[PDB]
């Protein structure tokens, strides 16, 4: 829902 | 027909595989299976090298066969699972892992793999549980240990922290020296005290995973252009990202493709992900000279072809090792110059990347040895944000006096001025300058809306909206896809912050905090009495852990206040309520740095050694606030404490940020693009002169 930089 | 013949060919292929001659290993495995088709281990082995080669469709078929032949082959279930996972079939992958565990309750790997699915889904306690099981079953398990270490990091469990770190470093050291793929992920490697040529080597080693997957395409080197004649005097830049859509990277650079000068540049945007329907994706599509949907071209060879045939001079990697990346495209090397930019905060370690776009404060030349790429310097900061464009309603504010504080009750809105002109008793405090509504009947109606928790009110025909209810008023405005069309009230009381306190905030995800950082903050909080710390439930399960270590450090529960994660616009906006922001030194706030600075909230930072720990300093340098950059932990605490105790100095610094955020180059996307353009042209002049990449440090 709240996007983040992910590996 | 002979099983002993077949067995030999398997042993011979296992040998060719240890020496990384994967090419030949396959040929042998395949002959082993032509001899004896019911050979379980050959099927399994062939499958796991096809998986390395990215030939997942076919690797799966051979795993299925391995199982058919040897139904108790727990190990083959687990690897099939991994193949299905890479094929985006998480449902069926999970079924494989569970099925392995039923067959062999004692088999560690399947437990670990199951934990990996849980981690990816965001359910972290269940991930921890399963990792722990795996480690009980197999106490020497680097993959599971490091993955668990990361989960613990995420929830801020710091049990046996110092010993845990020494072990990670130890595990990586051992794997690097035994020429194995490290268990720590490059995108995590900045969080641990790694021996740093280590971080570079971990990255390098992930780069190799691509080489293996592109070799099977047997593509000859591409013929790169050597002038700008075909491209009509224009330098062709391709941006490659999986994040043209609702993603931090788009919140930083969505305005840039449109700002390129069309006389000298032709801009291609290569999307790695389908249209998510958001305005961020709309804009890029509408403003880039060319927009190319590579999610429709899933084969890496055909995609690289397309890049080459479009005629790109500089290909920009905005992904590094983040989710969605397809570095195989860069490994194929379809453009003469290829640069890392913005989206990934570290080196790629890979040979196929030429430059990293950074700056002198983030990556000083002293530390060039951290990066495998050559450094290319932007003149101020390589960081940029779209806040001027996304949130112009926060360019000016106004307050309500409820007894002159700039952060207790705050109004923002495009039509704020017009509303204030309809009010009788507005006082104008000078700094621009800040209007102050006095406590009249109007002020009370606003406060009542906030207290009763109502959506919105009307006053003199203007719409006044409750800051906590914006997704109900206009959902696109909440996400940052539209500028809000109403006046928006934001108050401390909304978030349970004490009206008359010094508020120190940090809005980053909790994984960026470590026991030293929390110690530092506890120090600051004791020295500035009445102050509070403002953190997010990011994730919520991390909260009780912090509360715990906080009380251990002698801070009553009430000195740290946790809020839920907000929609993008509310999140940026509510930074205005803070007094100072305390930046995590382990891994800085990046997008979050820009977000807190746009609210005009000063931010104390302590630049570490890794790129990721220097970005905040770099942002502040550019803004022109050297007094917020600490040389050490003692200095950090001191700056923070001064800001909390010396109210005159606070007002001065706060005012300086509020002003500089417009007047400095930090949020100026036009100037940024132009600087970036100059940098591109340097890189090209250099290449066209027949040179291999070297540092562009101006
Ligand atoms: O790039 P960073 O490392 O600085 O940021 P992350 O990758 O950790 O992701 C943060 C994203 O989450 C947004 N955000 C923060 C708090 C909140 O309440 N809502 C919210 O949306 C940040 O804006 C950033 O995009």
Numbering used by the authors:
A (entry chain H): 2 to 8
B (entry chain D): 312 to 714, 719 to 746, 762 to 1028
Q: What does the published report state?
A:
Reversible post-translational modification of nuclear and cytoplasmic proteins with β-linked O-GlcNAc in metazoa is involved in numerous signal transduction cascades that regulate almost every cellular process. In common with many other glycosyltransferases, OGT is subject to product inhibition, and, accordingly, the most potent inhibitor of hOGT reported to date is the reaction product UDP (Kd 0.5 μM).
The resulting compounds were named goblin1 (OGT bisubstrate-linked inhibitor 1) and goblin2 respectively. In vitro glycosylation of a peptide substrate was inhibited in a dose-dependent manner with an IC50 value of 18 μM for goblin1 and 40 μM for goblin2. The crystal structure of the hOGT–goblin1 complex reveals the structural mimicry offered by the inhibitor, with both UDP and peptide moieties retaining the alignment observed in the Michaelis complex. As expected for a bisubstrate inhibitor, both fragments add synergistically to the inhibition: the ‘linker-only’ derivative of UDP was shown to be an order of magnitude less potent an inhibitor, whereas the ‘linker-only’ acceptor peptide was neither a substrate for the OGT nor an inhibitor. Attempts to inhibit OGT in cells appeared unsuccessful, probably due to the size/negative charge of the compounds.
